[PDB]
Amino acid sequence: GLGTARLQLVEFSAFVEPQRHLFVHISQLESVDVRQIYDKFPEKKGGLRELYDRGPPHAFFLVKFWADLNWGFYGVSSQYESLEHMTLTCSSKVCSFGKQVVEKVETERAQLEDGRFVYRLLRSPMCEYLVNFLHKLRQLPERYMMNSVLENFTILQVVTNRDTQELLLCTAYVFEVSTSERGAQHHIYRLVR
Numbered sequence: 001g002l003g004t005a006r007l008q009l010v011e012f013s014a015f016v017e018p019q020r021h022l023f024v025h026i027s028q029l030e031s032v033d034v035r036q037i038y039d040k041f042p043e044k045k046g047g048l049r050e051l052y053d054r055g056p057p058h059a060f061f062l063v064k065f066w067a068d069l070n071w072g073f074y075g076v077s078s079q080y081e082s083l084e085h086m087t088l089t090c091s092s093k094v095c096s097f098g099k100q101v102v103e104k105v106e107t108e109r110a111q112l113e114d115g116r117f118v119y120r121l122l123r124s125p126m127c128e129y130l131v132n133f134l135h136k137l138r139q140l141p142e143r144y145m146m147n148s149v150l151e152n153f154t155i156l157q158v159v160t161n162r163d164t165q166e167l168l169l170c171t172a173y174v175f176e177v178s179t180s181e182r183g184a185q186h187h188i189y190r191l192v193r
């Protein structure tokens with residue numbers, strides 16, 4: 001789906017609870033040129049461009065969400081799996097108008113489960129910054145204003161092998177807002193050059 005032979009994303013949701021509301025969701029394939037988006041993330045201090053050339057190009061993905069912003073615990077869940085036992089490092093960078101405003105580094109060790117190696121991060125507190133961002137966003141009176149604010153906002157996520165530092169996955173996230181009758185949606189694209 002979204003990943004490599006070495007690491008597969010199986011689940012991802014961002015949500016709010018009081019039986020829950022998913023802002024965005026991936027459950028479990030066209031291409032895009034990293035060129036079109038180079039200016040959206042950190043300029044050169046280890047951006048989509050420093051990263052992309054260092055390889056390996058098959059690891060880079062673009063994900064466009066159409067978030068459901070009509071609706072408590074603010075959480076994110078993710079689940080990866082692999083056939084090799086690793087400890088994963090996950091750098092997340094939140095970028096607003098190109099400026100990196102947040103960097104988060106997390107770690108997760110493989111748990112063996114049903115012949116596979118599973119990496120789970122279930123109901124982790126959503127970042128301070130995105131929660132507050134969400135509360136300002138929901139008050140805009142028109143979807144096209146939400147999209148205007150969001151066209152300046154991206155998240156770049158880099159998952160590496162912690163004990164080798166091989167890059168396993170690098171995802172760039174861009175966002176729009178869906179309406180009510182259509183809920184969340186995404187499209188996973190592949191970053192080429």
Ligand SMILES: O=C(Nc1ccccc1)N1CCN(C(=O)c2cccc(OCCC3CCCCC3)c2)CC1
Pocket residue numbers: 014023024067076077078080088089090092106107108119121127130155157159173175
């Ligand atoms: O896998 C993770 N850690 C991990 C730890 C060890 C090993 C592997 C992985 N994660 C934690 C960090 N993550 C995010 O902060 C994040 C990324 C994309 C969307 C998002 O929320 C969407 C909320 C807003 C966005 C703006 C308006 C619309 C809704 C949050 C991603 C998941």
